[PDB]
Structure 1
C-alpha cells in the first residue's frame, strides 16, 4: 500500500533531521565531586540512551518499509502508532504535554539533543568550571528541577554553607548585558504569561507571552527578612498546560500594581 511509502518517507526524513550520535561525559573524581557534573552526566546518559533507542527504531522502520524483514509484535505496535500519529510509550520517558503529536515531539527531541551536544562539547573542552557558565534552557532539560537543585548544591559546595539556608533571587536581564557571577547561572527560554518585566519590575499587560532574553539565577543566603508587599511569587511551569511545577520565583511588581491583580490574571513563567 501507499502508507508503506509515505511512512518510509517520514522515517527517512526523521532520521535525516535527528542528529546522529551523542557523546558521553568522561568521569573524573573531581568531576564526580561536583554536583552539576553529576546532573549533566545523568542527563547525557539518559539522552544518549533514548537517542540510540529512537535511531535504532527508525532504522528498523525504514528497513521494514523496504521489506528486508518482518513486523514483530512490538514493531507492529510501533508502526501502527506512528501511522495513527499518537506518541509511542517506549519513546516518551520524560514528561510531555498530553496532546503533543509525534512530529513536533521529534522536533523537540532534536532540539534537546542539540543542546545536549552543546553541553557535552563544552564539558569536554574544559571542566566543571566551564560547565558552570552554560546557559541551559529549563524546557530543554529532561529534568530541570534537577538542574536547579544541582545549582543549589553547586553554590553550597563552592562557598560552604547549608542548602536549607540558601534562597534564589531572579535577575531578568538581556543576554548581552549579563554578568557571570560565581552565584549566577544562565537560564534561557523562560516566558511570562500576561506580564512584562523591565529592570526586574513587573507590569500587567495584555501581551499574551513575553520572552526573557536570559534569566539569571543567583543563590543568596536566607536574609531572614520579611518580603515586601511589592514582591510577588510567580509559579514556573514546564509547558503551557502547566500541569507540572518546577520551582517558584519571587518578583517585585511595579508601583500602582495590585499583587491580587497579578494573581487573578494567572501571571506565570513558562519554560516552553
Structure 2
C-alpha cells in the first residue's frame, strides 16, 4: 500500500531529523547540593528517556515498514495515529498545545533535545557554576515553572535567605548588553503580545508580538513596599493557546498609559 511507503518515507525523514542521543549529567555531592543541577539533571533524564522511546518507536515503525516486524497492538495504534496525523499519546509526555500535529511536535522535540544537549555539554565542561550562567528558553524546557523555582532556591541558598521572603524582578535587556549578576538568570524566547518593552518600560503597540531579547530574572528581598500605580502584572503563558500559567511578571508602564487598557487588550508574555 502507498500509505505504508509514505509512512516509511516520513519515519526515515524524522529519524534523520531528530538528534541521536542525550547524555545524562554526572552526579556529585556538591552538584547534588546545588538545586539548579538537580533540576537540570531531572530535565536531562526525562529528555533522554523520551528521546530513546521515540527513536526506538520510529525504528520499530521502519522495521515494520520493511516488513521485517509485525504490527503489535502498541505498534498498530502508533501507526494508526501516524497515518491519521494525530499525536501519539505515548510520545506526548510534556505539555503541548492541543492543535499541534505530529510534524510540528517532532520539530519542537528536536529543538528541545538540541537545547538539552547544549546544556549537558556546558555542564560537563564546567559544573554548577557554569550551569548558572546558561541562557535557557522557558518554552524549550519541559517544566519551566520548575526552573523558576530552581532559580529561587539557588538565590535563597547562596545568600542564606528564606524562600518565602524572595520576590522576582524582570529586567528586559539585549543579550549583548546584559549583566550577569549573582541573582540574575538569563532567559530567551519570551515574546510580548500587545505591547513593546523598551528600557524595561511597556508601551502600547499594534504589533502582534514583540520578541524580548533577553529577560533577566532577579530574586530580591521583599521590600514590603506597595507596587506603584505604573506597575502592571502580566501573565507568562507557555504557548499561544494560553492554557498554562508559568508565573507572573511585573513591569512599569510608560507615562500616559492606562493599566486597564493593558488588561483589556490581553497583553501577555509567552514562552513560545
Corresponding position of 1:110? 110
Corresponding position of 1:73? 73
TM-score, reference length from structure 1: 1.00
Post-superposition CA distance 1:38-62 (Å, at most 9, x none):
0000000000000000000000001
Equivalent residue of 1:164, what SS?
helix
Post-superposition CA distance 1:165-186 (Å, at most 9, x none):
0000010000100011010000
Post-superposition CA distance 1:164-214 (Å, at most 9, x none):
000000100001000110100000000011100100000011000000110
* Counterpart Cα distance in 2 of 1:226 and 1:194: 26
The CA deviation at 1:126 is 0.4
* Counterpart Cα distance in 2 of 1:100 and 1:252: 34
Does structure 1 residue 171 correspond to structure 2 residue 171? yes
Which residues in structure 2 correspond to 1:199-214 (within 5 Å)? 199-214=199-214
Post-superposition CA distance 1:17-37 (Å, at most 9, x none):
000000000000000000000
Corresponding position of 2:187? 187
The CA deviation at 1:228 is 0.3
**Superposed structure 1 runs of 4+ greater than 6 Å apart:** none
Corresponding position of 1:219? 219
The CA deviation at 1:69 is 1.2
Aligned residues: 272
- Structure 1: runs of 5+ lacking an equivalent: none
TM-score, reference length from structure 2: 1.00
* CA root-mean-square deviation: 0.4
* Counterpart Cα distance in 2 of 1:5 and 1:40: 40
